[PDB]
Swiss-Prot record:
Contains a chromophore consisting of modified amino acid residues. Maturation of the chromophore requires nothing other than molecular oxygen. Changing V148I: In Azurite; shifts the excitation and emission spectra to shorter wavelengths and increases quantum yields compared to BFP. It comes from Aequorea victoria. Changing N196I: In mut2.1; shifts fluorescence lifetime from 3.03 to 2.50 ns. GO terms for biological process: bioluminescence; generation of precursor metabolites and energy. The keyword tRNA processing does not apply. The gene is GFP. This is Green fluorescent protein. Changing S200F: In H9; increases fluorescence at 395 nm excitation. Changing I165V: In P9; increases fluorescence at 475 nm excitation. In R10-3; matures to the red-emitting state with excitation and emission maxima at 555 and 585 nm, respectively.
Amino acid sequence: MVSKGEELFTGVVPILVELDGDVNGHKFSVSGEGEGDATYGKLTLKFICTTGKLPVPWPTLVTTLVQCFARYPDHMKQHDFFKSAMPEGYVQERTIFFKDDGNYKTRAEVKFEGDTLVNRIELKGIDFKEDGNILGHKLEYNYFSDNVYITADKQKNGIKANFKIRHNIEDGGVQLADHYQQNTPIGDGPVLLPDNHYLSTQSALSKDPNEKRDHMVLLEFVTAAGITLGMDELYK
């Protein structure tokens, strides 16, 4: 049957994102607006730095700035923790370790406000090098993709995840960002605790040619995978 939070995602849902950040004492805020269509795992978002110039590269914020918009295949619907927590939502926490550099620690609450899915985030970054790839703005602005590996966390009635992002550097190299993630429901209702699986995510970054503020346009696709259930046997 059609589960309860999942009903909230059958059509196009407006999204709002609000982030406050402090990285090595450089304080900033980002606001974003757009929409998600979980039927297609599709997100279209535009973010603005509302405090002026963003003091870190936009690509390093993409993962922090709504995995409830994942397309879960029909045969995997019992493994979608994210929608099962809705509308009351979940807390999403990460530590993001930038190899040979600093780290971000993030705490977000993702929940519905009326018909709008809202992601409210606090980010704290420490131990960055002033001339490293992050504070020195040496990262390319283009595209990345990777797999979010999810496991159940029965003790917190939630999930954990781990993944790597390989951010291209302007000189041809890679800046690795190792992500550790935990999500816990805000409400007390039952949630779906999943078997191990992953979200295949592709993030394409662009600019609005008419936008003079510091900003990012994001087109993202997010698809659950990694469980077969013998869907191959249907076709001999």
